Amino acid sequence: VERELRNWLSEVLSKINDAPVTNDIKKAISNQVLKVAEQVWNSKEELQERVRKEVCSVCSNVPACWAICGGLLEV
C-alpha cells in the first residue's frame, strides 16, 4: 500500500505548488498532507471528507483558502 499512497502524496504536493496562494499556505497544507499520509501508518466513504477537512483546517478563518485547498483535493 506504500506505493499507492505515495503516488497520491506526490500528486497532491505537485498540485499544491501550482496553487495561487502564498508560500505560507503551501507550507501549511503540505505539512498537513504529510501528517495525514504518515498517520495512515499510525464511515468508509467519508474519509475523502475527513482527510479533506483535516488538511485544510490550516485555512480556518478565511473561506477563500478553504476553496483552493478543497480544489486541490478533488482532482
Partner: antibody, heavy 120, light 107 residues
C-alpha cells in the same frame, strides 16, 4: 545524511559567465517537495538569496540579478547549476547551495561554500 | 518588497547575560527563521519556523514574535556564541535576510 557541495571556478574575468554546480547526496530532487537554492555572500556583506529550483522544475530568482541568472536541475546526476552572466567585480563572493523543502520554505542543510573572485 | 531590519547591528555582553536581537519586517509575514554564522563558515539554521530549535542548538536559544516583529534571544550568553545572526524570511519571494547582527563577548 544530507550533504551538499558547491563547485566552480575561483576566478572569472569581468563580463565572463560563472557556472556553479551544486552536488548533493542524502536526498533526491525527483522526490516531491524538494528544492535546492543558491545564496551568495559578498565579503563583509550580509547574505543574499539568488535562486531556487524545485522537484517540479519551478524556478525563482532574486529580482536584483534580473536577466543574469539561469538555474537548471539534473536529477540524474544529482546536480543543480546556477549560471550568472556578465560578472561584475562587485559579485565577488562566497556562493552556497542549500537544500529547501515545501514543508519548510527555509534552507536547513547548506553546502560548505565556494569562493569566486572576479578579477583580471 | 519584504525586507527586514535587525537591531542592534552589533552588541557586546558578558558571559551569562540575556541578549535579544530584533528582526522587524516591512510586511506581515507568516514565519521568521534565524541563522547563526561563525566567521568563515557556512550559516547554520538556529531557529526554524518561529520558535523551534534546530537540531543541536542548546536550550539557551529561544525565538518569538508575530506579524511584523520577531526576536531571537539567548538566555545565558556562552563564550561560543560569538557569531553573526541573520534573520531570514521565506513567506514571500524573493527570499530576503536581515542585515545581520554581530554578537561579541564582553570580557
Amino acid at each position: 545524511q544530507v550533504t551538499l557541495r558547491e563547485s566552480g571556478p575561483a576566478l572569472v574575468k569581468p563580463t565572463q559567465t560563472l557556472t556553479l554546480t551544486c552536488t548533493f547526496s542524502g536526498f533526491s530532487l525527483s522526490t516531491a517537495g524538494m528544492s535546492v537554492g543558491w545564496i551568495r555572500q559578498p565579503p563583509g556583506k550580509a547574505l543574499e538569496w539568488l535562486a531556487d529550483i524545485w522537484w517540479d522544475d519551478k524556478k525563482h530568482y532574486n529580482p536584483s540579478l534580473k536577466d543574469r541568472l539561469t538555474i537548471s536541475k539534473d536529477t540524474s546526476k544529482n546536480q543543480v547549476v546556477l549560471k550568472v552572466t556578465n560578472m561584475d567585480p562587485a559579485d565577488t563572493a562566497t556562493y552556497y547551495c542549500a537544500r529547501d523543502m515545501i514543508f519548510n520554505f527555509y534552507f536547513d542543510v547548506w553546502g560548505q561554500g565556494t569562493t569566486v573572485t572576479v578579477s583580471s | 518588497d519584504i525586507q527586514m531590519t535587525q537591531s542592534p547591528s552589533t552588541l557586546s555582553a558578558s558571559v551569562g547575560d540575556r541578549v535579544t536581537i530584533t528582526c522587524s519586517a516591512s510586511s506581515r509575514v507568516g514565519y521568521m527563521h534565524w541563522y547563526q554564522q561563525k566567521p568563515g563558515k557556512a550559516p547554520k539554521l538556529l531557529i526554524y519556523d518561529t520558535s523551534k530549535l534546530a537540531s543541536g542548538v542548546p536550550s539557551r536559544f529561544s525565538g518569538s514574535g508575530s506579524g511584523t516583529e520577531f526576536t531571537l534571544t539567548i538566555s545565558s550568553l556562552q563564550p561560543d556564541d560569538f557569531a553573526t545572526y541573520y534573520c531570514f524570511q521565506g513567506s514571500g519571494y524573493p527570499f530576503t535576510f536581515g542585515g545581520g547582527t554581530k554578537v561579541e563577548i564582553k570580557r
